[PDB]
């Protein structure tokens, strides 16, 4: 019944399956195994070495398992054919997959997603091109080998007495084809040796993800004591839905899945909006429809006013096209793969989408709705082949008296002109010529490069292109006459397009832009970014200001999706609101010069009118717009990317002249042959009977682009303002054509997304049809086009930025994939990565995932993350030491370290990871462990942990933090003209340097600030870290040697730093009953562990929380973007503690400006510290990550109301002590709610006994007046919090 023992047994079985014959005991911290490979020995033979073993090592251990190195046995992995215990099935899905395998003669060179091509023993250029495509598109990456995933799936399937379909498919494949591929355990990006097809790793990933989905849905349905999901009242099987969706995608997974994304989400959005009686959760907030001050009370059922409106033509067309897309997907699947199967259940469900009721208060419906949104993660990342297509000029829409292109242009100009006035009203302006070089730090790679020298210290060269390093070295070479006038629209001058993987969709295009183009854009677009940065405002159309309409900051402002999208739930709960959400297709492509660009440039130029007297290095502002958005800079640039390929024949290729086969300046893929030009490639290329691929090499394959680019400095702002112009014309036209039908209450624009909150004053279908037709016609006449099959126009349903709300409740979606990743992961610090993985699991469980399954996944991960990281250390005679360079014993052997699964529940500081078995959102610290083992209700759960809590070896961390000794020889040549006027004035004379050397500025003084910035920029680079961390394994060996298997808890953390362990200074007792009425929250579909926490503790209804000194100082310092990455709150606190309590605000301002902080941030810091002078206790609070996760931020904890209603503490404490006590109380109340303990009040109790009071006084004196600060003369006796200590607890 305890999760700990069952999880430990399961992971032990998984380990025993992966390594046969291993002895993995659950009563020890780790197990050490040796691995043998013969790669290094045969290459050492090239230098003349000899061994007595020859090839007896393999036969000694593969079947006999007798290879022991110094008493530690040698083992090997289990081969693929025995992963599934030799089981076999007759799965039809495997037949469907093997039928869909294509030969090489049906290749398409520029295919979007690769189909299933064969593997042949022969090797022509065609199969070589297939291989080159597969090596960089079938990658799994991740953090765990896929064979471990298969073994875990097998063990879990055995344990649950349930067999998933993907497991059947993999078993059937391996029972006849054996090893599909080989993957490196030390480096997961080494995939090779495809056997049957080039898409086998994708097949295995898809099967594993489907198995995980079936396990999750089965466990989640088991938690609620239900046997099947319901569509209204009709019973459905989620396993059947998942299997029918999984089988259909086998011939072409990525393409079919990307096709079928839209209809499923459309069905989920549209379900239940037409039922005559409807169920909603009441909500209440302010007058504005975007208000976040929402509280919820209860459920009810009311008649539907819009019942008769769903027989209109618009809804019929939406349903018809949504059906037709599914029909085409089914036809394509039945054609590519020899089968006649379809999706009967979803087709039957979709026919009655409008009128079938939806029940937010029933788990059987909410779980189904959430499940239909998450089955799209089976195919993994959408890695694809993106080809270059030029801008097709001759069909863009031109202004015309029958169009509205001139109108959107003029409105964009007007909005851009108004934005500058609104930004100036907030005292935010463009950069002045005095700030030109300073502002360049607000702008990782670039189009430039540099060479620098570094010195090893316990004289090498490296090449770097990072923006920080290239700026620091040659910032003066950017803003020059020769660099500004260059035109990148030729064969000798161009840029290159990048690619980034995304979880499901196709690969995103990245437009890297030179720094000399980015600087002029920044110069005139920084105030717009700063003005639109802040959150909040009025979104009423009658309101004059436009700062509230742009909602670019509204999302992700608070670390919780539920709190930041409460207006969605409120508006979906209301019966008076009709919601219109409109999405555009190819939004960026439609931003031509006729409708977008010229209006924007004209508006910027007209807004720059008052600043005509400025001169930026002799240049006017008009020239700055020309340099930033000019002809050869943005408008008509030529871009390089992926090559264009043609199919041809070899005989015609050799019959071609040698000149046409010249190898030009542009590289070509492996399997293609070089051709001089595009036209000569076109002349010979043929379709049928192809055996050769060719590509041009001279540079006529480049694409010319005249279209808004995603890499510009003001992309999002310009996109949102253009959307605002489109919405303005939409409102005007619908008001003109159908007066009095729709009234607009709210308008929101965040880019290409538009949202409206309106009231509808009609029920006749004809009027609604006319209104919808007018809206679509207005959108079409502006140069854009909106697909009617994705446009949302309905009540009781709101969707804004991947957040769904139906009838006042939260419908989450889980797209957090855990098996793969976009790029290769290097684990420099294991502990931080595991911490972040626990964070991700918390987010997933908050999205509707199963809590116990997440704990099992984490227990599986925690054992195998750190393995195979040791290749040089040899464990001989219980000693960890470096291997000898050449021997018959230690050559060709590596040590494998496998950690105990229970290390997930060992507090950070005892070499474990801070997770609590009661709930994943509770962090286990040391005093948390002590409190848990003092609770009698947790005895069975914590019993296995107590055995191994002291026996966890230290973790691998090559980024230990105190990295010093990589002193650079090259010097920063840019600091002279970038520094702020205080630093320049200080450097102007040496006597000022001598006087400021008395100041406690220390590391950030103007005499040594440049080296600090230079080193902080150098260590930011990756390859420099790899070079610096080359010899870390010696330090790790020393750490293992010095380890002692003892743990102990301390009250004080360091000198001047305290933590939640400070709460153990007093006794804690719970007493006093509180309210027992359960609270209402909009986010249903939670595991019982989270549900009880949200039932006993209500949702957060207070806007703000309590903050510490460090948090406030950090938030203030976040304003200074230039100095953000260098000065932390710790440095500022040290500076203000090295100053006395007798200081003036002006002195603080001037010293902060001397430390190169901007003047406004210095004033903020000075006024904050002057306000808190009496209450400042000069202590630092160390949070271990308490209440910082996604789910906990949605609870009514860490607030003043929580402290008032749950905590009673002595009045003598200072602010930081109260912060520590409050964190302790929050975590303890969360634990008590999770464990089912009665709701009580925490009371800090101190009796009248003299001995305990003397002990408390002594500990408080030690913490507030440490000895080390007394010896260094660093304590101010006149501080109020020090004078108070005389008579506190006498």
């Amino acid at each position: 019944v305890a999760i700990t023992v069952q999880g430990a047994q399961l992971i032990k079985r998984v380990v025993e399956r992966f390594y046969p014959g291993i002895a993995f005991n659950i009563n020890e911290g780790a197990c050490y195994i040796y691995k043998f490979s013969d790669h290094i020995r045969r290459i050492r033979m090239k230098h003349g070495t000899k061994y007595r073993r020859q090839a007896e090592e393999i036969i000694r251990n593969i079947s006999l398992r007798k290879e022991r190195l110094y008493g530690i046995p040698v083992l090997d992995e289990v081969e693929w054919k025995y992963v599934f215990d030799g089981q076999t099935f007759q799965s039809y899905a495997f037949e469907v997959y093997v039928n869909s395998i294509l030969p090489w003669s049906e290749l398409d060179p520029e295919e979007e997603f690769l189909r299933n091509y064969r593997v042949s023993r022969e090797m022509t250029e065609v199969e070589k091109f297939i291989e080159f495509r597969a090596k960089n598109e079938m990658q799994i990456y991740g953090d765990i080998p896929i064979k471990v995933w298969c073994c875990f799936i097998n063990e879990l399937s055995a344990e649950l007495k349930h067999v998933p379909l993907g497991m059947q498919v993999m078993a059937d494949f391996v029972n006849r084809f054996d090893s599909p591929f080989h993957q490196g355990n030390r480096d997961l990006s080494n995939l090779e040796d495809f056997q049957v097809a080039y898409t086998t790793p994708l097949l295995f990933e898809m099967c594993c993800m489907e198995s995980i989905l079936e396990f999750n849905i089965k466990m989640r349905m088991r938690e609620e004591e239900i046997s099947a999901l319901e569509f209204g009242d009709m019973k459905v099987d989620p396993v059947g839905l998942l299997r029918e969706f999984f089988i259909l995608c086998l011939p072409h997974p990525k393409k079919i899945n990307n096709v079928l994304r839209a209809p499923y989400s459309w069905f989920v959005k549209m379900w239940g909006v037409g039922a005559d009686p409807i169920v909603v959760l009441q909500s209440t907030a302010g007058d504005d429809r975007n208000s976040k001050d929402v509280f919820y009370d209860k459920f009810r059922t009311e008649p539907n006013r819009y019942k008769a409106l769903f027989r209109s033509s618009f809804y019929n067309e939406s349903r018809r096209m949504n059906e037709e897309k599914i029909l085409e997907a089914v036809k394509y699947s039945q054609k590519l793969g020899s089968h006649d199967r379809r999706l009967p259940l979803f087709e039957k469900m979709l026919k009655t989408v409008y009128t079938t009721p939806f029940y937010p208060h029933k788990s059987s419906n909410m779980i189904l709705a959430s499940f239909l949104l998450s089955i799209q993660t089976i195919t993994g990342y959408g890695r694809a082949w993106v080809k270059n297509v030029s801008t097709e000029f001759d069909k863009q829409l031109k202004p015309n008296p029958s169009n509205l292109v001139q109108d959107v242009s003029d409105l964009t100009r007007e909005f851009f002109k108004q934005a500058y006035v609104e930004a100036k009203e907030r005292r935010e302006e463009i950069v002045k010529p005095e700030d030109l070089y300073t502002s360049m730090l607000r702008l990782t790679s670039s189009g430039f490069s540099t060479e620098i020298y570094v010195k090893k210290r316990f004289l090498i060269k490296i090449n770097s292109r990072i923006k920080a390093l290239v700026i620091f070295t040659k910032g003066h070479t950017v803003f020059t006459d020769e660099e500004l006038h260059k035109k990148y629209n030729s064969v000798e001058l161009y840029q290159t397009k990048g690619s980034r993987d995304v979880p499901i969709k196709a690969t995103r295009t990245i437009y890297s832009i030179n720094l000399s183009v980015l600087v002029p854009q920044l110069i005139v677009t920084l105030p717009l970014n700063e003005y639109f940065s802040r959150v909040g405002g009025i979104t009423s159309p009658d309101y004059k200001k436009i700062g509230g309409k742009v909602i670019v900051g509204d999302l992700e402002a608070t670390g919780s999706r539920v709190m930041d999208a409460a207006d969605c739930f409120r508006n979906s709960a209301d019966r008076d609101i009709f919601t219109i959400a409109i999405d555009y297709s190819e939004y960026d492509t439609h931003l031509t010069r006729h409708n977008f660009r010229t209006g924007m440039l004209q508006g910027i130029r007209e807004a720059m009118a008052p600043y005509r007297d400025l001169r930026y290095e002799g240049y006017t502002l008009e020239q700055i717009i020309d340099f930033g958005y000019g002809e050869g800079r943005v408008a008509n640039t030529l871009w390089n990317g992926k090559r264009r390929l043609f199919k041809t024949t070899f005989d015609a290729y050799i019959r071609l002249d040698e000149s046409e086969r010249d190898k030009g300046s542009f590289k070509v893929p492996k399997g293609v042959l070089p051709v001089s030009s595009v036209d000569v490639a076109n002349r010979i290329a043929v379709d049928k009977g192809f055996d050769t691929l060719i590509a041009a090499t001279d540079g006529s394959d480049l694409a010319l682009i005249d279209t808004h680019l995603s890499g510009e400095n003001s992309t999002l702002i310009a996109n949102s303002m253009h959307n605002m112009a489109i919405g303005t014309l939409m409102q005007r036209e619908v008001g003109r054509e159908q007066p009095g039908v729709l009234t607009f209450l709210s308008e929101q624009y965040v880019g290409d997304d538009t949202l409206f909150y309106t009231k509808l004053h009609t029920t006749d279908t004809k009027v609604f049809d006319k209104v919808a037709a007018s809206i679509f016609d207005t959108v079409a006449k502006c140069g854009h086009e909106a697909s009617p099959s994705k446009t949302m126009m309905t009540p009781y349903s709101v969707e804004k930025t991947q957040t769904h709300a139906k009838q006042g409740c939260y419908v989450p979606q889980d797209r957090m994939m855990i098996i793969s990743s976009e790029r290769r992961k290097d684990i420099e610090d294991v502990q931080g990565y595991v911490r972040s993985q626990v964070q991700t699991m918390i987010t997933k469980v908050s999205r509707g995932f199963c809590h116990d399954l997440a704990q099992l996944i984490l227990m599986l991960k925690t054992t195998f993350i750190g393995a195979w990281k040791m290749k040089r250390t040899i464990k001989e005679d219980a000693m960890y030491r470096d291997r000898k360079f050449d021997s018959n014993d230690e050559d060709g052997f590596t040590l494998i370290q496998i950690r105990n699964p229970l290390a997930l529940y060992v507090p950070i500081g005892w070499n474990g990871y801070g997770a609590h078995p009661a709930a994943l959102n509770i962090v286990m610290t040391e005093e948390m462990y002590v409190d848990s083992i003092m609770i009698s209700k947790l005895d069975e759960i914590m019993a296995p942990i107590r055995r191994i809590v002291h026996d966890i070896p230290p973790c691998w961390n090559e980024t230990q933090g105190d990295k010093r000794g990589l002193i650079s020889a090259t010097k920063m040549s840019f600091f002279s003209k970038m520094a702020r006027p205080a630093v320049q004035a200080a450097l102007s004379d040496p006597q000022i340097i001598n006087l400021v050397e008395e100041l406690p500025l220390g590391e950030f003084s103007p005499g040594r600030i440049s080296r600090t910035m230079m080193h902080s920029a150098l260590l930011k680079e990756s390859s420099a870290r790899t070079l610096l961390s080359s010899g870390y394994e010696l330090e790790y060996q020393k750490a293992l040697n010095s380890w002692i298997t003892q743990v102990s808890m301390r009250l004080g953390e360091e000198s001047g730093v305290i933590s939640t362990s400070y709460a153990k200074l007093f006794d804690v007792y719970f007493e006093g009953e509180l309210d027992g009425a359960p609270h209402m929250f909009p986010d249903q579909n939670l595991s019982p562990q989270f549900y009880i926490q949200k039932m006993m503790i209500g949702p957060r209804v207070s806007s703000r929380v309590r903050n510490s000194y460090v948090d406030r100082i950090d938030v203030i310092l976040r304003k200074d973007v230039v100095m953000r990455g260098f000065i932390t709150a710790n440095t500022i606190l040290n500076v203000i503690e090295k100053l006395g309590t007798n200081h003036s605000v002006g002195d603080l301002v001037t010293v902060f400006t001397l430390m190169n902080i901007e003047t406004r941030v210095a004033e903020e810091l000075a006024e904050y510290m002057t306000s808190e002078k009496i209450r400042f206790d000069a202590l630092k609070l160390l949070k271990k990550g308490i209440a910082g996760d996604e789910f906990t931020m949605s609870l009514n904890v860490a607030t003043q109301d929580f402290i008032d209603t749950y905590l009673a503490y002595p009045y003598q404490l200072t602010k930081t002590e109260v912060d520590a006590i409050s964190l302790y109380c929050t975590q303890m109340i969360m634990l008590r709610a999770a464990l089912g303990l009665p709701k009580k009040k925490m009371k800090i109790v101190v009796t009248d006994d003299a001995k305990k009071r003397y002990k408390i006084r002594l500990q408080r004196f030690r913490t507030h007046v440490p000895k080390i600060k007394v010896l260094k003369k660093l304590i101010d006796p006149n501080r109020m919090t020090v004078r108070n200590l005389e008579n506190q607890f006498v």
Binding site: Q6, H361, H851
Partner: peptide, 21 residues
């Protein structure tokens, strides 16, 4: 396997769901 959430909190969840019904 068995459900790792004990019955004490699950009964409360069932009761509040029945109150919703």
């Amino acid at each position: 396997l068995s459900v790792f959430a004990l019955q004490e909190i699950m009964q409360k969840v069932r009761q509040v769901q029945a109150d919703y019904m």
